[PDB]
Design an enzyme around this catalytic site. Structure first.
Site, PDB file in Angstrom:
ATOM      1  N   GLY A  10      16.766  30.537 -21.383  1.00 36.10           N
ATOM      2  CA  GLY A  10      18.076  31.131 -21.582  1.00 36.10           C
ATOM      3  C   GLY A  10      19.111  30.631 -20.589  1.00 36.10           C
ATOM      4  CD  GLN A  36      24.963  28.821 -16.288  1.00 33.15           C
ATOM      5  OE1 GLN A  36      25.941  28.383 -16.890  1.00 33.15           O
ATOM      6  NE2 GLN A  36      24.943  30.029 -15.737  1.00 33.15           N
ATOM      7  CD  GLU A  90      24.410  28.574 -26.539  1.00 39.56           C
ATOM      8  OE1 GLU A  90      25.001  27.645 -27.131  1.00 39.56           O
ATOM      9  OE2 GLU A  90      24.887  29.185 -25.560  1.00 39.56           O
ATOM     10  N   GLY A 105      19.658  39.213 -21.419  1.00 44.52           N
ATOM     11  CA  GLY A 105      19.920  38.343 -22.546  1.00 44.52           C
ATOM     12  C   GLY A 105      18.895  38.487 -23.659  1.00 44.52           C
ATOM     13  N   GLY A 106      19.274  37.994 -24.836  1.00 43.92           N
ATOM     14  CA  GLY A 106      18.396  37.969 -25.991  1.00 43.92           C
ATOM     15  C   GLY A 106      17.274  36.957 -25.870  1.00 43.92           C
ATOM     16  CB  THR A 119      27.434  38.923 -20.887  1.00 44.18           C
ATOM     17  OG1 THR A 119      26.020  38.746 -21.052  1.00 44.18           O
ATOM     18  CG2 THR A 119      27.909  38.133 -19.673  1.00 44.18           C
ATOM     19  CD  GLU A 166      23.214  42.312 -19.793  1.00 41.52           C
ATOM     20  OE1 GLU A 166      22.497  42.098 -18.796  1.00 41.52           O
ATOM     21  OE2 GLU A 166      24.386  41.889 -19.891  1.00 41.52           O
ATOM     22  CG  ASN A 221      23.179  38.980 -11.684  1.00 44.78           C
ATOM     23  OD1 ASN A 221      22.782  38.094 -10.924  1.00 44.78           O
ATOM     24  ND2 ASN A 221      23.477  38.748 -12.958  1.00 44.78           N
ATOM     25  CD  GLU A 261      -3.644  32.684   3.755  1.00 48.00           C
ATOM     26  OE1 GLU A 261      -4.414  31.773   3.409  1.00 48.00           O
ATOM     27  OE2 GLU A 261      -3.252  32.848   4.924  1.00 48.00           O
TER      28      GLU A 261
HETATM   29  N1  LIG Z   1      22.529  35.343 -11.685  1.00 48.61           N
HETATM   30  C1  LIG Z   1      22.865  34.938 -12.916  1.00 48.61           C
HETATM   31  N2  LIG Z   1      22.873  35.811 -13.920  1.00 48.61           N
HETATM   32  C2  LIG Z   1      23.233  35.236 -15.090  1.00 48.61           C
HETATM   33  C3  LIG Z   1      23.574  33.923 -15.326  1.00 48.61           C
HETATM   34  N3  LIG Z   1      23.882  33.733 -16.666  1.00 48.61           N
HETATM   35  C4  LIG Z   1      23.725  34.916 -17.203  1.00 48.61           C
HETATM   36  N4  LIG Z   1      23.335  35.872 -16.303  1.00 48.61           N
HETATM   37  C5  LIG Z   1      23.073  37.278 -16.577  1.00 48.61           C
HETATM   38  O1  LIG Z   1      22.093  37.353 -17.583  1.00 48.61           O
HETATM   39  C6  LIG Z   1      22.428  38.390 -18.538  1.00 48.61           C
HETATM   40  C7  LIG Z   1      22.678  37.750 -19.879  1.00 48.61           C
HETATM   41  O2  LIG Z   1      21.577  36.866 -20.186  1.00 48.61           O
HETATM   42  P1  LIG Z   1      21.882  35.341 -20.549  1.00 48.61           P
HETATM   43  O3  LIG Z   1      20.962  34.456 -19.783  1.00 48.61           O
HETATM   44  O4  LIG Z   1      23.346  35.085 -20.448  1.00 48.61           O
HETATM   45  O5  LIG Z   1      21.459  35.323 -22.090  1.00 48.61           O
HETATM   46  P2  LIG Z   1      20.329  34.540 -22.902  1.00 48.61           P
HETATM   47  O6  LIG Z   1      19.013  34.806 -22.273  1.00 48.61           O
HETATM   48  O7  LIG Z   1      20.779  33.138 -23.075  1.00 48.61           O
HETATM   49  O8  LIG Z   1      20.375  35.308 -24.305  1.00 48.61           O
HETATM   50  P3  LIG Z   1      21.198  35.148 -25.679  1.00 48.61           P
HETATM   51  O9  LIG Z   1      22.516  34.552 -25.312  1.00 48.61           O
HETATM   52  O10 LIG Z   1      21.328  36.528 -26.239  1.00 48.61           O
HETATM   53  O11 LIG Z   1      20.377  34.248 -26.548  1.00 48.61           O
HETATM   54  C8  LIG Z   1      23.613  39.138 -17.919  1.00 48.61           C
HETATM   55  O12 LIG Z   1      23.168  40.203 -17.091  1.00 48.61           O
HETATM   56  C9  LIG Z   1      24.286  38.039 -17.097  1.00 48.61           C
HETATM   57  O13 LIG Z   1      25.058  38.556 -16.039  1.00 48.61           O
HETATM   58  C10 LIG Z   1      23.562  32.999 -14.254  1.00 48.61           C
HETATM   59  O14 LIG Z   1      23.833  31.793 -14.276  1.00 48.61           O
HETATM   60  N5  LIG Z   1      23.189  33.613 -13.060  1.00 48.61           N
HETATM   61 MG   LIG Z   2      22.684  30.787 -23.646  1.00 48.66          MG
HETATM   62 MG   LIG Z   3      -7.884  30.349   5.625  1.00 46.75          MG
END
Ligand SMILES: Nc1nc2c(ncn2[C@@H]2O[C@H](COP(=O)(O)OP(=O)(O)OP(=O)(O)O)[C@@H](O)[C@H]2O)c(=O)[nH]1
Ligand SMILES: [Mg+2]
Ligand SMILES: [Mg+2]
Ligand SMILES: Nc1nc2c(ncn2[C@@H]2O[C@H](COP(=O)(O)OP(=O)(O)OP(=O)(O)O)[C@@H](O)[C@H]2O)c(=O)[nH]1
Ligand SMILES: Nc1nc2c(ncn2[C@@H]2O[C@H](COP(=O)(O)OP(=O)(O)O)[C@@H](O)[C@H]2O)c(=O)[nH]1
Ligand SMILES: Nc1nc2c(ncn2[C@@H]2O[C@H](COP(=O)(O)OP(=O)(O)O)[C@@H](O)[C@H]2O)c(=O)[nH]1
Ligand SMILES: COc1ccc(/N=N\c2cc(OC)c(CCBr)c(OC)c2)cc1O
Ligand SMILES: [Ca+2]
Ligand SMILES: [Ca+2]
Ligand SMILES: [Mg+2]
Ligand SMILES: [Mg+2]
Lengths: 440, 428, 439, 431
Positions: free
Chosen positions: A10, A15, A71, A143-144, A179, A183, A206, A254
């Protein structure tokens, strides 16, 4: 030898994977084209960094990593970014339609179309290992894809690799950056579904990361780039034990035996210090004692919770850089007194220490100051249950009205899977209650 | 020929084992390539006890190196004397035991154990009058603890009438690798009670206190600890390596040191306590050597001997000294602490002298005691076992390898019995 | 002429047998290669020394001895020592591993496997004897071989040679020199088993020889060499009657007729005088009366007891050197009045006296000075029971707690043999009490 | 490759539909011929969502133009950007609908509903990854009201798992087109409650009121009403057209705004509403934008949000502002107005920012609320409907087409329940 494969799932997982591998390269001397001039063994070797990097005959060092997302937009940036030449294309896998913040779509509707291909690619990586140690899984809770697809992948990994260990680097949802409204749902669903397939999970709140960037780094409005650069520092500290060697370096496996007293109690709390800006680092150097004390400040923790309201079952200190044992011992001695470290009665009250001598690195243009010494503290405290309680309560508020539940049922899920996931969460909270009670 | 076959297993066992071969090699005039470069015939009179005679007048140790990971294997092969070891005697795996007794004893060690047994035999085959086996290991990890005890059981099955002797390092919270060290230790002590004839209890807690309290070393390392271990191993094997009025072997040692079969755990003691560099400009009078040897601060096992009683004592003085003043000073000790020696074993204190001192010392003393005070050690490990087992903490690391809880229950029940038996002769 | 075969068992027996046979050679004029210029009958003869030496056609004089140890490091010394040329390879029997200070292991485990070989090597020696009188057996009480194997040998010798005499030279254990903590166990076990198979036994207590070496020879830490070179002097004085012309104790059967009126009570005390330091360049020559009187001093006895508080059953006086009878009668006349000598009523109060004109020989480079007259007194006194009492008490302290017993039971000996031996010991102590105790 | 297929039906549908393409075309740098003449790469990053690539660097909208009469379709073809549309995607009839819902849903609209479907399939099949449909129509007329809902039903049959989004215009007597408009509206709301995933409620009454009161327009025409609609459609689709996450597509918007399937009718808001008034001194700041955006005077629906409660809210700011100020201001509104947000849906206000402001505005703010106060809008239709149906007025218009009275009372009772639902959740508590 003892290779780890990393899997970034995801947006958040992908990232954060970016940040980590860019940092790994700058720490080992690997260039954005995968060339490592310091590496004198062409085509292979059993050096410590080979636990995370494979080698081609042309001297390229390729991350033992798979990026996956339903995606392409996020992975497309890796495909055209500064480190586009580090990965083979087969390591970057993308669908055409994401989960829409819906666990059901990530685990079933969309995820089922790509799961086989993802596992095939992981297999390819595994076949290149002489002694595969386990997997590191990076994903978000909210996220999904990060929840739904990760759960599906976790379940499949247990089938194909048995009890081979799987570690999680998870992102816990915070409102300042959330987002999606649903969640909490996705969070509880994935937590319940992965508990029995994961040996250890490092949760990054976060909100904790956001507030540290704000107070300690003087960043008015932190973005993902700010949060991710600081997270990769925590990840670099945890994995360094496996990517470097040293007389005083202790393997993470360990610590793993000291951090997990029961299977379900596998959520350690991470603290990192010093998190300082260049404007402030210039002036004051930070001693071992100073950075060690910072590890017991609640404000420096990766998850929001008050550890003095709980009990410790393990405390590991992972020092890095200009640090000698004499200093560490002095620091703990004073900490032991001026602080309220309360241990459960059934485990020894000690601090497991490891000292890597490779100093910390900073990405150019980052916000962290370059320091001569750093520490990440990994501790198992019943206080982390607070994060469970907060997340569980938001879940209860919505589920009582069955709000948004139709987006999941319409995809195939049953209401029973919600109460089941919640019942599990409820038991987990009681489980943390019980480990803290004193003995007869 | 009374040959002895040496085995070192795991990290601790292979680091202390390598130091042992480096120390006694020096004493016997052998260099890192196995050629004899000494000045005294006394160095070679009993060299075949620990060394095979190679084709071309060199000596190779009768030693077998065993581990479930290659890390420490390579550290030895790269050490000062790493080249003196028979290359075919290195048996190692790739998976490691994860500080887990179960992995060492049941799962991971199960497949390497035959490869190890194949070398032991080859090595025993070449023995003219094989005397027994000597094993170095810790009890707090997995390879030396779990696989180590598995080898003892394997070896005793094929050599039921040879002597089995071990140098076993006890864990301590002051020098701890992991928290499950009490689990690993308790399971091993149950093996040792059943399957060995002599065990030297080398206590990491005692070694730490000597380095920090006496030697004034703020932050002790395993190298500091192991300097005390090798000095103790040198002394305690002196009677087997050099000729004397008492030509000792492992069986004569056992018949005179163990009055009851299960009570075969010895406290070692050494004097003078020296450090890495040290200096030793003032030599010690035999009166000083003798009084230091018997003080608790020179015990290699954290036990107050005054809390118990010596069943049997064995002492060796090394160097050019009046054998009369040794006799005088030793009999003066027995009379200064008459109440710490049982009275139903007459003449239970035996002392021997050897004019060859260790490297860098004009004279020294080493002492084994079979003392009821050893019960304090087993009690300490038992209390730490129970605090965790009471709540079944960290048990999943073992049950996930096929082990049942009953095995733990059995192991601790047998160690509390051992404490009881010791207590039974403290009141005689 | 009648022959004697000496059997040396264990380290103490072998090393003492070495010291003796060396002395025998210096006394009779036999050189280290077996040649005897004094001997004029070549390869034959019926002289008095033929009781201990056989002859080859080439003139070699061979001791009628057999050395047996369950381990070779001690017998290798004999095999490469000064008198190596004196012995035939078959006269030295060595094994692989020893008894580990364990009577059981010596008698039962290692013993069962080496006994036949040893008995065959003896049979070869006996076949060379025209009228064998019996055997002299040298061993320690405390060793596993000396105690365990010896008793089994004595058992078989009684079967193979019924009408033959068995004489014992036994080293009684002393802590100053003892090497094992279980030596009291081995002492009681072997004493009980040999009692019925030994006709007469000379105990040497290492404690006594040790103090004589420090008191009279000025040796701070006596070693086995010192101890043994003195023991062989006593042994030599005892056996001189068998290797020289004479009329007293001319065969092993007189040793019992004159010293053993009760079979079980066959432990005569040996006293020897004078013991003079060879480092004493100038010393007065003691008279017959002076050395005879030293025979009733406790400091000069092979076992530390108090004959004043016992009864005598037989007293033998053996002088070597410049001794005319007239002086002996005068000496006995005095020691009667002054000292306290009380015989049992069922026995004559007197002294059998033997005088050998050849004085004692001293090994060159030894510790003892050359003297013009010496005396060995063999007396069967109940006082020696003190040594049984101390030994039995040490046994009782350990056996009460069953300490070290598992080592013996593990060799196949059954625990009941311990108390059966102890019961015999308790009978012996009572036997002594009855022969010489009064209300 | 998150393509949307756009459909315009009827006068209103094509009117506001035409202005929509004018406005977003000018934002993405596309001229009336379809060439790109912009300056920022951000304009072409998501151009695929609404435009097809045409050989030669032409950008054609993915729009279908439909009407039971050729009048409006001739005009849209002669206005600005008339040549941009594909002439194949014009699908007009001739009999007209006479502002009669029954004619557009059952009889006249039926004859033409197949032609329109073939164009939908042609456009849909040409999509790398089709996302959903957005339809612009009116609820008061005959074509967009009757046949618009007939199309929604037909498309849903072939694309049952795609998103159905409508810009549905509510009838007001202040802009009255015909007397029978409450009938057509009710019959349509009954279709929208069941067959669409998300519906923006663009209310002619709210639009007329803004022009008269705020914009001070005595004689507001359809052109003035539509400048407001186009400004709303522009902002309400900003997060779909420009880089950035958060409501990046129609399904993520549906998941985060619709907590129960039937309650999918959104109240749009816009600020600054003064599009061309005569009071300067504007000096628009982040605080004022937030304040105004949550005022009843800025809602494109005649409902007072302080008469109900927000289930969910989405706000998007466009222009150059400090993100920290937006965050702080957005927090200040929720806190100050906490009583008007359901407590049981935690963190139910999300905020997006886009750098690209609308044409001629230093900064703007668009608002999308799911509020129980919307029952005010449905209540107004219901009681106007009931005023006619009670007397059986004008029923023969509809019965002559085949409809029965049960169809009227059905749609009637359904919309009564809709109001009942909104009230149920307005009174729901978290304890
Ligand atoms: N620390 C951090 N949190 C992130 C980042 N990108 C998204 N989030 C958090 O992750 C959550 C959303 O999940 P995403 O990773 O954006 O979504 P996904 O897993 O791609 O899911 P879908 O878009 O529904 O397919 C939210 O709480 C965002 O704040 C990032 O680069 N860093
Ligand atoms: Mg994505
Ligand atoms: Mg040892
Ligand atoms: N006088 C004297 N005593 C000795 C000598 N050697 C050993 N002893 C004593 O004899 C006892 C031990 O018996 P050893 O002869 O050494 O034993 P062994 O017969 O070889 O028995 P194992 O070694 O058990 O097979 C101890 O009391 C020693 O002090 C010696 O040369 N002279
Ligand atoms: N004295 C000493 N103890 C050691 C040494 N290495 C490890 N230990 C101890 O041994 C235990 C760990 O066993 P180890 O040998 O590391 O594990 P293994 O490789 O699985 O046998 C702990 O109690 C350590 O403190 C060493 O070099 N010296
Ligand atoms: N805002 C707005 N409303 C319009 C426009 N044209 C028609 N309407 C409204 O649409 C309703 C009648 O529907 P209309 O589109 O004329 O008829 P149809 O073609 O049969 O759907 C009335 O409420 C009109 O006020 C327009 O350009 N703008
Ligand atoms: C009962 O008391 C005894 C203990 C032992 C022994 N047997 N001979 C020994 C003696 C030694 O200790 C002094 C050593 C050197 C250890 Br510092 C020895 O090699 C280990 C063998 C004999 C004994 O009588
Ligand atoms: Ca390489
Ligand atoms: Ca002759
Ligand atoms: Mg022997
Ligand atoms: Mg009209």
């Amino acid at each position: 030898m003892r290779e780890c494969i990393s899997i970034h799932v995801g947006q958040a997982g992908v990232q954060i994977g970016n940040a980590c591998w860019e940092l790994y390269c700058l720490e080992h001397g690997i260039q954005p084209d995968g060339q490592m001039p310091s590496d004198k063994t062409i085509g292979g070797g059993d050096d410590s960094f080979n636990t995370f990097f494979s080698e081609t005959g042309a001297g390229k060092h390729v991350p033992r990593a798979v990026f996956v997302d339903l995606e392409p937009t996020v992975i497309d940036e890796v495909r055209t970014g500064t480190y586009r030449q580090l990965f083979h294309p087969e390591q970057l896998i993308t669908g055409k339609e994401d989960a829409a913040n819906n666990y059901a779509r990530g685990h079933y509707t969309i995820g089922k179309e790509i799961i086989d291909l993802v596992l095939d690619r992981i297999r390819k990586l595994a076949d290149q290992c002489t002694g595969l140690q386990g997997f590191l899984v990076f994903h978000s809770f909210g996220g999904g894809t990060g929840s739904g697809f990760t759960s599906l992948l976790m379940e499949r990994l247990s089938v194909d690799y048995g009890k081979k260990s799987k570690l999680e680097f998870s992102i816990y949802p915070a409102p300042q950056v959330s987002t999606a409204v649903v969640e909490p749902y996705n969070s509880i669903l994935t937590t319940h579904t992965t508990l029995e397939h994961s040996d250890c999970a490092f949760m990054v709140d976060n909100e904790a990361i956001y507030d540290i960037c704000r107070r300690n780094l003087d960043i008015e409005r932190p973005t993902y780039t700010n949060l991710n650069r600081l997270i990769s520092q925590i990840v670099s500290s945890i994995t360094a034990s496996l990517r470097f060697d040293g007389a005083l370096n202790v393997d993470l496996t360990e610590f793993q035996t000291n951090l997990v007293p029961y299977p379900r109690i596998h959520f350690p709390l991470a603290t990192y210090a010093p998190v300082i800006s260049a404007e402030k680092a210039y002036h004051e150097q930070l001693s071992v004692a100073e950075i060690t004390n910072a590890c017991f400040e609640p404000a420096n923790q990766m998850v929001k919770c008050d550890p003095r309201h709980g009990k410790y079952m393990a405390c590991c200190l992972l020092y890095r850089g200009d640090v000698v044992p004499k200093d560490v011992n002095a620091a703990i001695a004073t900490i032991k007194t001026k602080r309220s470290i309360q241990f459960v009665d059934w485990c020894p009250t000690g601090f497991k220490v490891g000292i890597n001598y490779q100093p910390p690195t900073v990405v150019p243009g980052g916000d962290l100051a370059k320091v001569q010494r750093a520490v990440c503290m990994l501790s198992n405290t019943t206080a982390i249950a607070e994060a469970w309680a907060r997340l569980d309560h938001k879940f209860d508020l919505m589920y009582a009205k069955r709000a948004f539940v139709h987006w999941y049922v319409g995809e195939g899920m049953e209401e029973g899977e919600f109460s089941e996931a919640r019942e599990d969460m409820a038991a987990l909270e009681k489980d943390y209650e019980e480990v803290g009670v004193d003995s007869v | 020929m009374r040959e002895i076959v040496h085995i070192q297993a795991g990290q601790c066992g292979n680091q202390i084992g390598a130091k042992f071969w480096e120390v006694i090699s020096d004493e016997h005039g052998i260099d890192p390539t196995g050629s004899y470069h000494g000045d005294s015939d006394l160095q070679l009179e009993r060299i075949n006890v620990y060394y095979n005679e190679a084709t071309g007048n060199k000596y190779v140790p009768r030693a077998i190196l065993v581990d479930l990971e290659p890390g420490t294997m390579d550290s030895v092969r790269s050490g000062p004397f790493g080249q003196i070891f028979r290359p075919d005697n290195f048996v190692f795996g790739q998976s490691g035991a994860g500080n887990n007794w179960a992995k060492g004893h049941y799962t991971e060690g199960a497949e390497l154990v035959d490869s190890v047994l194949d070398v032991v035999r080859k090595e025993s085959e070449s023995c003219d009058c094989l005397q027994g086996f000597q094993l170095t290991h810790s009890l707090g990890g997995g390879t030396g603890s779990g696989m180590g005890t598995l080898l003892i059981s394997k070896i005793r099955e094929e050599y039921p009438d040879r002597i089995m002797n071990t140098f076993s390092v006890m864990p301590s919270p002051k020098v701890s690798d992991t928290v499950v060290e009490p689990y690993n230790a308790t399971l091993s002590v149950h093996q040792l009670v059943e399957n060995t004839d002599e065990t030297y209890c080398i206590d990491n807690e005692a070694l730490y206190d000597i380095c920090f309290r006496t030697l004034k070393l703020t932050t002790p390392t395993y190298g500091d600890l192991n300097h005390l271990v090798s000095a103790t191993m040198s002394g305690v094997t002196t009677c087997l390596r050099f000729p004397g009025q008492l030509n000792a072997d492992l069986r004569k040692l056992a018949v005179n040191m163990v009055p009851f079969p299960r009570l075969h755990f010895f406290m070692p003691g050494f004097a003078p306590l020296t450090s890495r560099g040290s200096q030793q400009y003032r030599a010690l009078t035999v009166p000083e050597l003798t009084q230091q040897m018997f003080d608790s601060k020179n015990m290699m096992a954290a036990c107050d001997p005054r809390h118990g009683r010596y069943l049997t004592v064995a002492a060796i003085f090394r160097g050019r000294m009046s054998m009369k003043e040794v006799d005088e000073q030793m009999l003066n000790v027995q009379n200064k602490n008459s109440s710490y020696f049982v009275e139903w074993i007459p003449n239970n204190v035996k002392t021997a002298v050897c004019d060859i001192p260790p490297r860098g010392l004009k004279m020294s003393a080493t002492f084994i005691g079979n003392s009821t005070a050893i019960q304090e050690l087993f009690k300490r490990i038992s209390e730490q076992f129970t605090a965790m087992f009471r709540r079944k903490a960290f048990l999943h690391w073992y049950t996930g390898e096929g082990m049942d809880e009953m095995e733990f229950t059995e192991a601790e029940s047998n160690m509390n019995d051992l404490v009881s038996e010791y207590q039974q002769y403290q009141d005689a």
